[PDB]
Amino acid sequence: GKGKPRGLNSARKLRVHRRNNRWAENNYKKRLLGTAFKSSPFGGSSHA
Amino acid sequence: GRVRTKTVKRASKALIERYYPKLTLDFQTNKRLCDEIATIQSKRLRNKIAGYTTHLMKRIQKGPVRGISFKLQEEERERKDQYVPEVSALDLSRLNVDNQTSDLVKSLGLKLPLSVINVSA
Amino acid sequence: PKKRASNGRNKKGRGHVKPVRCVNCSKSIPKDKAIKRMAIRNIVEAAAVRDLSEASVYPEYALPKTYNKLHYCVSCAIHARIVRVRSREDRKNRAPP
Amino acid sequence: GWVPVTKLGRLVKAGKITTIEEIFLHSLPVKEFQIIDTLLPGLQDEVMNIKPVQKQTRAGQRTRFKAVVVVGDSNGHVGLGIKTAKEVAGAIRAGIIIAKLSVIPIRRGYWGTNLGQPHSLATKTTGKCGSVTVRLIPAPRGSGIVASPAVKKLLQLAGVEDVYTQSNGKTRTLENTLKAAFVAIGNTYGFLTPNLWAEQPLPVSPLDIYSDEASA
Amino acid sequence: MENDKGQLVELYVPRKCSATNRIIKADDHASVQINVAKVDEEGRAIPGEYVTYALSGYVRSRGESDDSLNRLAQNDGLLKNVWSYSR
Amino acid sequence: SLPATFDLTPEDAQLLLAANTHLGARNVQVHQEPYVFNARPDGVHVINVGKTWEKLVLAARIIAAIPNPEDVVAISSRTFGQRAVLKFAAHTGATPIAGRFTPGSFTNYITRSFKEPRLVIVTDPRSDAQAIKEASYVNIPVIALTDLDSPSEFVDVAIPCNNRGKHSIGLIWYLLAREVLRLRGALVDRTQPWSIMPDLYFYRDP
Amino acid sequence: VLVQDLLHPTAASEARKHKLKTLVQGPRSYFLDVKCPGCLNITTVFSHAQTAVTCESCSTILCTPTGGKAKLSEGTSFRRK
Amino acid sequence: TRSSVLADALNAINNAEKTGKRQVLIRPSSKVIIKFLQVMQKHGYIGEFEYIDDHRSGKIVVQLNGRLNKCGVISPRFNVKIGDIEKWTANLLPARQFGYVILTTSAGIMDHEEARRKHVSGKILGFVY
RNA sequence: AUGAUCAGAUACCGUCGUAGUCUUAACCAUAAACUAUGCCGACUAGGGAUCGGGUGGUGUUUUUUUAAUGACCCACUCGGCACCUUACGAGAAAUCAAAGUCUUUGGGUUCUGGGGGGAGUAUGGUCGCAAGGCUGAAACUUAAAGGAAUUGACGGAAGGG
Ligand SMILES: [Mg+2]
Ligand SMILES: [Mg+2]
Ligand SMILES: [Mg+2]
Ligand SMILES: [Mg+2]
Ligand SMILES: [Mg+2]
Ligand SMILES: [Mg+2]
Ligand SMILES: [Mg+2]
Ligand SMILES: [Mg+2]
Ligand SMILES: [Mg+2]
Ligand SMILES: [Mg+2]
Ligand SMILES: [Mg+2]
Ligand SMILES: [Mg+2]
């Protein structure tokens, strides 16, 4: 049945699975942890 | 070694396809009629094509050789193939059956002279 | 890649098969993976057969046999020319020659 | 000249066969390119790319050239040929021969309302070669061919005016994507639709009407 | 297929398989079209008078061409007791 | 439909059950074979020879429909059918291929053995598989002298027969030739038999 | 085969199937009336019994249970009811 | 275990129509299966079918002509409003001129075009073309 | 601990040999724990073997020559461990009767992955007597790492000429 749940009341499982697997990305994880504001020399600005 | 090459073995079989009724089982007469009826640039090559063509003819006196197809040869083989057999092997003048053959022919709606024998396992 | 559909052994439905020792190097090998042969030999090896047959106290004597089942690892069986490497199409042949 | 050897070649040289719809109708296997450029004299070709393939040898690499060719006339017919050769011009010439040999028809249709001439395809249709899948979706008028450049020129040469396309897979493999698009437009005459539901009298083959215009 | 005022478009209305009602494509090189000769009152076949059967490459590769041709011939009356519905 | 002189005569039935054409295969049976009539306590099956007669007259109707008789092709790579297809090719316009079918004879239009037939008849589909396989490339119908265990893929008309026997293969080719000449009108006497003996189509040992 | 009558299978082919895989499922078992030596006392016994069925008049045990069909005792006369 | 008898029915019909067979046995034959088959039959996609009464659920033998490409189910039965019908038909029908989305509305089971005529919507069951 | 080999050899080889190997009562909770294929359900090709049960066959054989039995044979069926052939189909291919019924994409449900390193590392929990187990990053760094096949070259691999 292709992995994922398909039931009409199964939106919560799909939502939390998408959040958990969204953490596997590069740009999303960087934006949400805020490494540019913390661990970047320019601190997230374009110029310095 | 004296194994002949394509040129000798290929021209000779082509030559036999279109000149089989002229040429014979004698290398000498063979080496004369090729010399007019085909162009070979050297005498040594003419002597090997004629020599192998003489060899192939003797093979043709006894049965068919593979790799030749001229319409004459098979048709004469076709002609002497009846043998006119004395009586047809299928016909018994004086037939045998199992039980299943017997009810098969009774299903077909045919009456014919039959002798039933049991064919057991 | 997977080289053999049988994984180089014969085990479909156990999980574990208790091992044997190679007769040549004492390597532990599962009993299904081994190269089992059966060495049946007369004891007198057919060159001493006339000398012992005329040296016997008995006529008509049996000239008995030795029976042994040899268990080989893959390395020793390949090194001792018992089995050898075959072609990709010829690996699927299970018949003896 | 030509001096054909096929029953079909003798029929097309004699003038018994005046269209290639009869070939497509009776599924006659074409084996002579003179049939195709006789029955479709107006098709024009285009070579897609020339990429060099290499076979390793004792000293260095034997190299040859692979040329991909698309022929077609701009209403209904396309062919795709791919040939490897020692020389680039031989690869292009032989690819034009192979592309002419593989000419198939295309079923054009309407996105709606059947007013003008058929502008688009009749159904959604897919094709697959390698990893590549090309899907082709019927588009409204004035949409144009929405496709990458190679499969756009293939659909331009078919005679399609407007189609949406979707791809999947390693689409940068150009020969695979052209063969996938070729299968996708070949399937248009494969889909059975309610206008095709009605039964037909199964017409008899030109090879048996004209059976004595063969060799003997 | 036709436009808003008759004018049939979709040139090459194709053939359909006599067994599965499937379209025979232009490159289905396994498909055949059987012509069986008609007879009239004398035992002799009439030249050009056929009963015609198209069979697609799909049923031929599956091996089921012979049973399909049996059922089609028996339905058209040119066989008597070869095909059975109750299988 | 047919004028009911085409029914299985007792004379033809005598020929069929004399040649053991009814003696089919062993309990191997390709599931595409409903032609079998019962079974023998032996383990060998019996073929319904009435269906063999009906399939043979259907194949004769198919052969007679071809306009130019040279476009029929008869194949036998087995020795028991070579003389049979040569005699069938004598009595009918058909071209024979007896012995080796060289591949690429139906494809490969520059080959020296290039035929373009409108119908091909093979003796065994298993042994003559190269001919039926090429015929599936160029839209050619196939008629096969089938057995109860033969590989019937790409065969359109399967005439069930005992193709293990010498007399059966020759009798089937003989009856096929006789029926196509009767439908063509070379044999005007539908009821009277043929002056050619069925023993002419038989294999001889040397 | 691509054309067949699924509504009317032949009697042989339905007899070949498992009891649940036929068109409508039904038992292949049956009942017997068994008469015991001596007293007439006809009694009906299931074909696959699972019990040592005895006639009410005497301990004259009529069938023994097995893995399948019950084995009827040797002097007994049954009719398939 | 069996959750959707209608899905199993439609999968069996699809496998039969791929193989070229003219018939298929459906088990276990619910009401929605009958109504779905009646919708397919009125448009000419199947032909005659017969309901075998065993006493447990029924079986069905459908007769297949050559006209069906794919009958499918949509699981779950999504709630569908009236604009949703046009997005669903654009997603899963091959052209805008043939094929039907079947949906169970409160006025019975029907296809999408008759639902447009009655101006009614509901839940989506499957599709046929 | 020793005796050889070796440039070196506290490695491969040889002789001994502690812990261990065995068992009882407690812990540990990992393996290439592998079929590297989650479980439940339906459908789609043939075939021959075998294991367990059942049915049928006036079938062979044993025993009270006749009987059940038991063991075999033939046919069928249910459930299993597998195997052979096709390729309907699938796939990047090797290959696969499931890894099919997947752009014509929806039978139910659970778990995991998102370029290679850093790294199964730090850190914080939590279990454990310990050894460790389970959860588990980032800074930074890099344009490939990888899979399956092809043609060469080589092999202290096997054959042939
Ligand atoms: Mg729900
Ligand atoms: Mg990174
Ligand atoms: Mg390796
Ligand atoms: Mg293990
Ligand atoms: Mg994409
Ligand atoms: Mg040491
Ligand atoms: Mg794992
Ligand atoms: Mg499953
Ligand atoms: Mg059993
Ligand atoms: Mg079994
Ligand atoms: Mg098991
Ligand atoms: Mg690799």
PDB file of C-alpha atoms in Angstrom, chain D:
ATOM      1  CA  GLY D   1      18.053   3.151 -60.724  1.00  0.00           C
ATOM      2  CA  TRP D   2      16.371   1.282 -57.918  1.00  0.00           C
ATOM      3  CA  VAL D   3      15.540  -2.314 -59.159  1.00  0.00           C
ATOM      4  CA  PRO D   4      13.668  -3.253 -56.011  1.00  0.00           C
ATOM      5  CA  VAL D   5      13.647  -6.547 -54.160  1.00  0.00           C
ATOM      6  CA  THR D   6      10.489  -6.857 -52.012  1.00  0.00           C
ATOM      7  CA  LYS D   7       6.925  -7.546 -53.129  1.00  0.00           C
ATOM      8  CA  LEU D   8       6.053  -4.167 -51.595  1.00  0.00           C
ATOM      9  CA  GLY D   9       8.851  -2.445 -53.501  1.00  0.00           C
ATOM     10  CA  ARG D  10       7.569  -3.821 -56.811  1.00  0.00           C
ATOM     11  CA  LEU D  11       4.037  -2.671 -55.946  1.00  0.00           C
ATOM     12  CA  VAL D  12       5.155   0.830 -54.973  1.00  0.00           C
ATOM     13  CA  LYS D  13       7.348   1.097 -58.094  1.00  0.00           C
ATOM     14  CA  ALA D  14       4.473  -0.026 -60.325  1.00  0.00           C
ATOM     15  CA  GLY D  15       2.140   2.604 -58.870  1.00  0.00           C
ATOM     16  CA  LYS D  16      -0.282   0.144 -57.304  1.00  0.00           C
ATOM     17  CA  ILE D  17       0.309   1.663 -53.855  1.00  0.00           C
ATOM     18  CA  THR D  18      -0.229   5.431 -53.863  1.00  0.00           C
ATOM     19  CA  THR D  19      -0.255   6.143 -50.072  1.00  0.00           C
ATOM     20  CA  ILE D  20       1.512   4.858 -46.970  1.00  0.00           C
ATOM     21  CA  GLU D  21      -1.773   4.584 -45.114  1.00  0.00           C
ATOM     22  CA  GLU D  22      -2.186   1.236 -46.862  1.00  0.00           C
ATOM     23  CA  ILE D  23       1.159   0.139 -45.389  1.00  0.00           C
ATOM     24  CA  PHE D  24       0.092   1.343 -41.944  1.00  0.00           C
ATOM     25  CA  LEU D  25      -3.299  -0.313 -42.358  1.00  0.00           C
ATOM     26  CA  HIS D  26      -1.962  -3.734 -43.315  1.00  0.00           C
ATOM     27  CA  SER D  27       1.184  -3.415 -41.123  1.00  0.00           C
ATOM     28  CA  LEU D  28       3.405  -4.211 -44.096  1.00  0.00           C
ATOM     29  CA  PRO D  29       7.096  -4.359 -43.071  1.00  0.00           C
ATOM     30  CA  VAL D  30       9.089  -1.791 -45.032  1.00  0.00           C
ATOM     31  CA  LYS D  31      12.672  -2.826 -45.768  1.00  0.00           C
ATOM     32  CA  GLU D  32      13.571  -0.434 -48.622  1.00  0.00           C
ATOM     33  CA  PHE D  33      13.957   3.323 -48.079  1.00  0.00           C
ATOM     34  CA  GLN D  34      12.952   4.118 -51.659  1.00  0.00           C
ATOM     35  CA  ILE D  35       9.387   3.103 -50.760  1.00  0.00           C
ATOM     36  CA  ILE D  36       9.298   5.736 -48.034  1.00  0.00           C
ATOM     37  CA  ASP D  37      10.770   8.636 -49.974  1.00  0.00           C
ATOM     38  CA  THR D  38       8.606   7.681 -52.981  1.00  0.00           C
ATOM     39  CA  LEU D  39       5.354   7.626 -51.009  1.00  0.00           C
ATOM     40  CA  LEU D  40       6.369  10.655 -48.876  1.00  0.00           C
ATOM     41  CA  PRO D  41       8.593  12.826 -51.083  1.00  0.00           C
ATOM     42  CA  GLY D  42       8.180  15.915 -48.880  1.00  0.00           C
ATOM     43  CA  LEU D  43       9.716  14.805 -45.582  1.00  0.00           C
ATOM     44  CA  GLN D  44      12.716  16.786 -44.351  1.00  0.00           C
ATOM     45  CA  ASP D  45      15.422  15.617 -41.923  1.00  0.00           C
ATOM     46  CA  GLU D  46      17.563  17.004 -39.101  1.00  0.00           C
ATOM     47  CA  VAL D  47      20.571  15.536 -37.291  1.00  0.00           C
ATOM     48  CA  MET D  48      20.317  15.880 -33.515  1.00  0.00           C
ATOM     49  CA  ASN D  49      23.892  15.253 -32.377  1.00  0.00           C
ATOM     50  CA  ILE D  50      27.136  13.434 -33.162  1.00  0.00           C
ATOM     51  CA  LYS D  51      28.771  11.926 -30.116  1.00  0.00           C
ATOM     52  CA  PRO D  52      31.908   9.749 -30.193  1.00  0.00           C
ATOM     53  CA  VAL D  53      31.913   6.272 -28.681  1.00  0.00           C
ATOM     54  CA  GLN D  54      35.112   4.385 -27.906  1.00  0.00           C
ATOM     55  CA  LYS D  55      36.249   0.765 -27.748  1.00  0.00           C
ATOM     56  CA  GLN D  56      39.469   0.110 -25.870  1.00  0.00           C
ATOM     57  CA  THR D  57      42.226  -1.795 -27.693  1.00  0.00           C
ATOM     58  CA  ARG D  58      45.815  -2.960 -27.210  1.00  0.00           C
ATOM     59  CA  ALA D  59      47.191   0.532 -27.951  1.00  0.00           C
ATOM     60  CA  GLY D  60      44.582   3.225 -27.504  1.00  0.00           C
ATOM     61  CA  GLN D  61      40.932   3.686 -28.309  1.00  0.00           C
ATOM     62  CA  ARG D  62      39.103   2.770 -31.489  1.00  0.00           C
ATOM     63  CA  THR D  63      36.636   5.660 -31.838  1.00  0.00           C
ATOM     64  CA  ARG D  64      33.430   5.881 -33.862  1.00  0.00           C
ATOM     65  CA  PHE D  65      30.648   8.425 -34.310  1.00  0.00           C
ATOM     66  CA  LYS D  66      26.997   7.996 -33.271  1.00  0.00           C
ATOM     67  CA  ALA D  67      24.527  10.190 -35.208  1.00  0.00           C
ATOM     68  CA  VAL D  68      20.852  10.640 -34.260  1.00  0.00           C
ATOM     69  CA  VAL D  69      18.512  11.665 -37.099  1.00  0.00           C
ATOM     70  CA  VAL D  70      14.814  12.580 -37.129  1.00  0.00           C
ATOM     71  CA  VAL D  71      12.941  12.657 -40.413  1.00  0.00           C
ATOM     72  CA  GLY D  72       9.381  13.716 -40.783  1.00  0.00           C
ATOM     73  CA  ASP D  73       6.848  15.605 -42.814  1.00  0.00           C
ATOM     74  CA  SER D  74       4.920  18.179 -40.885  1.00  0.00           C
ATOM     75  CA  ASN D  75       1.560  16.425 -40.965  1.00  0.00           C
ATOM     76  CA  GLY D  76       1.399  13.001 -39.375  1.00  0.00           C
ATOM     77  CA  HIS D  77       4.662  11.082 -39.921  1.00  0.00           C
ATOM     78  CA  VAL D  78       8.050  10.761 -38.140  1.00  0.00           C
ATOM     79  CA  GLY D  79      10.995   8.429 -38.110  1.00  0.00           C
ATOM     80  CA  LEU D  80      13.974   8.081 -35.792  1.00  0.00           C
ATOM     81  CA  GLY D  81      17.294   6.536 -36.734  1.00  0.00           C
ATOM     82  CA  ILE D  82      20.534   6.151 -34.791  1.00  0.00           C
ATOM     83  CA  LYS D  83      23.711   4.852 -36.439  1.00  0.00           C
ATOM     84  CA  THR D  84      27.346   4.394 -35.393  1.00  0.00           C
ATOM     85  CA  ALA D  85      30.034   4.631 -38.067  1.00  0.00           C
ATOM     86  CA  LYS D  86      33.730   5.213 -38.660  1.00  0.00           C
ATOM     87  CA  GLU D  87      32.961   8.492 -40.460  1.00  0.00           C
ATOM     88  CA  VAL D  88      30.565  11.291 -39.515  1.00  0.00           C
ATOM     89  CA  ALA D  89      29.104  11.662 -43.001  1.00  0.00           C
ATOM     90  CA  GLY D  90      28.441   7.940 -43.288  1.00  0.00           C
ATOM     91  CA  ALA D  91      26.739   8.007 -39.896  1.00  0.00           C
ATOM     92  CA  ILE D  92      24.454  10.844 -40.997  1.00  0.00           C
ATOM     93  CA  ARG D  93      23.649   9.236 -44.399  1.00  0.00           C
ATOM     94  CA  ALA D  94      22.896   5.840 -42.889  1.00  0.00           C
ATOM     95  CA  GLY D  95      20.889   7.464 -40.109  1.00  0.00           C
ATOM     96  CA  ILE D  96      18.703   9.193 -42.697  1.00  0.00           C
ATOM     97  CA  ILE D  97      18.133   5.746 -44.267  1.00  0.00           C
ATOM     98  CA  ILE D  98      17.267   4.172 -40.896  1.00  0.00           C
ATOM     99  CA  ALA D  99      15.036   7.093 -39.891  1.00  0.00           C
ATOM    100  CA  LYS D 100      13.129   6.816 -43.164  1.00  0.00           C
ATOM    101  CA  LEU D 101      12.667   3.081 -42.587  1.00  0.00           C
ATOM    102  CA  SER D 102      11.018   3.660 -39.182  1.00  0.00           C
ATOM    103  CA  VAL D 103       8.229   6.055 -40.213  1.00  0.00           C
ATOM    104  CA  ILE D 104       5.045   5.697 -38.125  1.00  0.00           C
ATOM    105  CA  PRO D 105       1.785   7.676 -38.060  1.00  0.00           C
ATOM    106  CA  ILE D 106       0.585  10.065 -35.358  1.00  0.00           C
ATOM    107  CA  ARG D 107      -3.020  10.431 -34.201  1.00  0.00           C
ATOM    108  CA  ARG D 108      -3.733  14.138 -33.874  1.00  0.00           C
ATOM    109  CA  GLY D 109      -6.885  15.296 -32.089  1.00  0.00           C
ATOM    110  CA  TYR D 110      -8.743  18.109 -30.320  1.00  0.00           C
ATOM    111  CA  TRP D 111      -8.500  19.475 -26.809  1.00  0.00           C
ATOM    112  CA  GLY D 112     -12.192  20.249 -27.202  1.00  0.00           C
ATOM    113  CA  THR D 113     -15.167  21.070 -29.400  1.00  0.00           C
ATOM    114  CA  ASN D 114     -13.790  19.686 -32.775  1.00  0.00           C
ATOM    115  CA  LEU D 115     -14.070  22.989 -34.626  1.00  0.00           C
ATOM    116  CA  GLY D 116     -11.079  23.398 -36.907  1.00  0.00           C
ATOM    117  CA  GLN D 117      -8.460  20.817 -37.985  1.00  0.00           C
ATOM    118  CA  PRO D 118      -6.858  18.557 -35.327  1.00  0.00           C
ATOM    119  CA  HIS D 119      -4.251  20.638 -33.491  1.00  0.00           C
ATOM    120  CA  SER D 120      -3.295  18.468 -30.526  1.00  0.00           C
ATOM    121  CA  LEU D 121      -3.112  14.817 -29.507  1.00  0.00           C
ATOM    122  CA  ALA D 122      -6.175  12.703 -28.813  1.00  0.00           C
ATOM    123  CA  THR D 123      -5.131  11.262 -25.437  1.00  0.00           C
ATOM    124  CA  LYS D 124      -2.444  11.414 -22.828  1.00  0.00           C
ATOM    125  CA  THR D 125       0.262   9.032 -23.958  1.00  0.00           C
ATOM    126  CA  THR D 126       3.538   7.859 -22.452  1.00  0.00           C
ATOM    127  CA  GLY D 127       6.722   6.159 -23.560  1.00  0.00           C
ATOM    128  CA  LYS D 128       9.823   4.833 -21.881  1.00  0.00           C
ATOM    129  CA  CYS D 129      13.391   4.027 -22.904  1.00  0.00           C
ATOM    130  CA  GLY D 130      16.034   3.467 -20.269  1.00  0.00           C
ATOM    131  CA  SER D 131      15.179   5.375 -17.145  1.00  0.00           C
ATOM    132  CA  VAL D 132      13.563   8.148 -19.192  1.00  0.00           C
ATOM    133  CA  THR D 133       9.768   8.481 -19.328  1.00  0.00           C
ATOM    134  CA  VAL D 134       8.128  11.078 -21.582  1.00  0.00           C
ATOM    135  CA  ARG D 135       4.438  11.872 -21.120  1.00  0.00           C
ATOM    136  CA  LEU D 136       2.449  13.963 -23.609  1.00  0.00           C
ATOM    137  CA  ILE D 137      -0.734  15.791 -22.593  1.00  0.00           C
ATOM    138  CA  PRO D 138      -3.252  17.465 -24.965  1.00  0.00           C
ATOM    139  CA  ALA D 139      -3.033  21.291 -24.794  1.00  0.00           C
ATOM    140  CA  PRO D 140      -5.401  24.104 -25.866  1.00  0.00           C
ATOM    141  CA  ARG D 141      -4.870  26.132 -29.007  1.00  0.00           C
ATOM    142  CA  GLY D 142      -2.007  28.589 -29.041  1.00  0.00           C
ATOM    143  CA  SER D 143      -0.182  26.766 -26.268  1.00  0.00           C
ATOM    144  CA  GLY D 144       2.566  25.603 -28.611  1.00  0.00           C
ATOM    145  CA  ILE D 145       4.819  22.661 -27.964  1.00  0.00           C
ATOM    146  CA  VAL D 146       5.904  22.913 -24.330  1.00  0.00           C
ATOM    147  CA  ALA D 147       8.946  20.667 -24.449  1.00  0.00           C
ATOM    148  CA  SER D 148      12.713  20.660 -24.227  1.00  0.00           C
ATOM    149  CA  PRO D 149      14.442  21.507 -27.571  1.00  0.00           C
ATOM    150  CA  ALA D 150      15.074  18.000 -28.979  1.00  0.00           C
ATOM    151  CA  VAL D 151      11.632  16.556 -28.287  1.00  0.00           C
ATOM    152  CA  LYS D 152      10.170  19.905 -29.362  1.00  0.00           C
ATOM    153  CA  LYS D 153      11.727  19.535 -32.802  1.00  0.00           C
ATOM    154  CA  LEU D 154      10.498  15.911 -32.948  1.00  0.00           C
ATOM    155  CA  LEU D 155       6.929  17.022 -32.187  1.00  0.00           C
ATOM    156  CA  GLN D 156       7.260  19.901 -34.652  1.00  0.00           C
ATOM    157  CA  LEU D 157       8.253  17.385 -37.304  1.00  0.00           C
ATOM    158  CA  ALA D 158       5.265  15.176 -36.423  1.00  0.00           C
ATOM    159  CA  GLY D 159       2.736  17.875 -37.131  1.00  0.00           C
ATOM    160  CA  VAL D 160       1.562  18.561 -33.618  1.00  0.00           C
ATOM    161  CA  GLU D 161       0.850  22.213 -32.920  1.00  0.00           C
ATOM    162  CA  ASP D 162       0.411  22.176 -29.122  1.00  0.00           C
ATOM    163  CA  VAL D 163       1.128  19.640 -26.387  1.00  0.00           C
ATOM    164  CA  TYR D 164       2.160  19.648 -22.737  1.00  0.00           C
ATOM    165  CA  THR D 165       5.075  17.354 -21.932  1.00  0.00           C
ATOM    166  CA  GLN D 166       6.360  15.897 -18.652  1.00  0.00           C
ATOM    167  CA  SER D 167       9.607  13.971 -18.216  1.00  0.00           C
ATOM    168  CA  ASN D 168      11.140  11.644 -15.643  1.00  0.00           C
ATOM    169  CA  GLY D 169      14.596  10.153 -15.357  1.00  0.00           C
ATOM    170  CA  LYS D 170      17.989  10.985 -16.785  1.00  0.00           C
ATOM    171  CA  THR D 171      16.573  13.212 -19.513  1.00  0.00           C
ATOM    172  CA  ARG D 172      20.067  14.462 -20.424  1.00  0.00           C
ATOM    173  CA  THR D 173      20.606  11.090 -22.154  1.00  0.00           C
ATOM    174  CA  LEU D 174      19.390  12.407 -25.480  1.00  0.00           C
ATOM    175  CA  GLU D 175      19.085   9.144 -27.455  1.00  0.00           C
ATOM    176  CA  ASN D 176      17.004   7.551 -24.680  1.00  0.00           C
ATOM    177  CA  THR D 177      14.745  10.598 -24.420  1.00  0.00           C
ATOM    178  CA  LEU D 178      14.184  10.615 -28.177  1.00  0.00           C
ATOM    179  CA  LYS D 179      13.323   6.914 -28.190  1.00  0.00           C
ATOM    180  CA  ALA D 180      10.962   7.464 -25.249  1.00  0.00           C
ATOM    181  CA  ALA D 181       9.256  10.337 -27.061  1.00  0.00           C
ATOM    182  CA  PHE D 182       9.106   8.199 -30.203  1.00  0.00           C
ATOM    183  CA  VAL D 183       7.316   5.415 -28.348  1.00  0.00           C
ATOM    184  CA  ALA D 184       4.996   7.993 -26.760  1.00  0.00           C
ATOM    185  CA  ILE D 185       3.826   9.403 -30.081  1.00  0.00           C
ATOM    186  CA  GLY D 186       3.665   5.902 -31.535  1.00  0.00           C
ATOM    187  CA  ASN D 187       1.142   4.904 -28.888  1.00  0.00           C
ATOM    188  CA  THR D 188      -1.402   7.496 -30.095  1.00  0.00           C
ATOM    189  CA  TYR D 189      -2.698   5.029 -32.700  1.00  0.00           C
ATOM    190  CA  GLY D 190      -2.609   2.326 -30.007  1.00  0.00           C
ATOM    191  CA  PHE D 191      -5.169   3.808 -27.653  1.00  0.00           C
ATOM    192  CA  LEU D 192      -8.722   2.676 -28.367  1.00  0.00           C
ATOM    193  CA  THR D 193     -11.324   5.395 -27.897  1.00  0.00           C
ATOM    194  CA  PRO D 194     -15.149   5.370 -28.253  1.00  0.00           C
ATOM    195  CA  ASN D 195     -14.994   6.867 -31.761  1.00  0.00           C
ATOM    196  CA  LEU D 196     -12.958   3.768 -32.740  1.00  0.00           C
ATOM    197  CA  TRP D 197     -15.404   1.346 -31.080  1.00  0.00           C
ATOM    198  CA  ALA D 198     -17.409   0.638 -34.255  1.00  0.00           C
ATOM    199  CA  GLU D 199     -16.560  -2.491 -36.210  1.00  0.00           C
ATOM    200  CA  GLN D 200     -14.895  -2.615 -39.611  1.00  0.00           C
ATOM    201  CA  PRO D 201     -15.002  -4.993 -42.595  1.00  0.00           C
ATOM    202  CA  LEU D 202     -11.220  -5.888 -42.386  1.00  0.00           C
ATOM    203  CA  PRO D 203     -10.045  -4.959 -45.912  1.00  0.00           C
ATOM    204  CA  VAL D 204      -8.033  -7.388 -47.958  1.00  0.00           C
ATOM    205  CA  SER D 205      -4.314  -6.925 -48.467  1.00  0.00           C
ATOM    206  CA  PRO D 206      -2.736  -5.281 -51.540  1.00  0.00           C
ATOM    207  CA  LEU D 207      -0.282  -8.200 -51.553  1.00  0.00           C
ATOM    208  CA  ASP D 208      -3.156 -10.453 -52.664  1.00  0.00           C
ATOM    209  CA  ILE D 209      -4.981  -8.087 -55.026  1.00  0.00           C
ATOM    210  CA  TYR D 210      -1.695  -7.453 -56.843  1.00  0.00           C
ATOM    211  CA  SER D 211      -0.052 -10.837 -56.247  1.00  0.00           C
ATOM    212  CA  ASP D 212       1.182 -11.236 -59.847  1.00  0.00           C
ATOM    213  CA  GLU D 213       3.104  -7.922 -59.851  1.00  0.00           C
ATOM    214  CA  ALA D 214       5.603  -9.661 -57.579  1.00  0.00           C
ATOM    215  CA  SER D 215       8.788 -11.358 -58.924  1.00  0.00           C
ATOM    216  CA  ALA D 216       6.936 -14.380 -60.325  1.00  0.00           C
TER     217      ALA D 216
END
